[PDB]
Amino acid sequence: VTLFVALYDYEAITEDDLSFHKGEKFQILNSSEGDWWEARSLTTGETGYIPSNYVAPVD
After folding, report:
1. Which CATH number is 1-59 given?
2. Burial label, 5 (beta-carbon count in 10 A; 0-12, 13-18, 19+)
């Protein structure tokens, strides 16, 4: 799949969110018309929701 990269730091708002650091990489697990996607971090291996505007596709 296409991997994604964090444009900014994100501190979890909800208990289901993934926290992450700028530059962190992600597999995107689910991505709807959400403001929120669900992803898994490649640095911590943690899973949870992220803001879809905080990430960009890696190429």
Report:
1. 2.30.30.40
2. middle
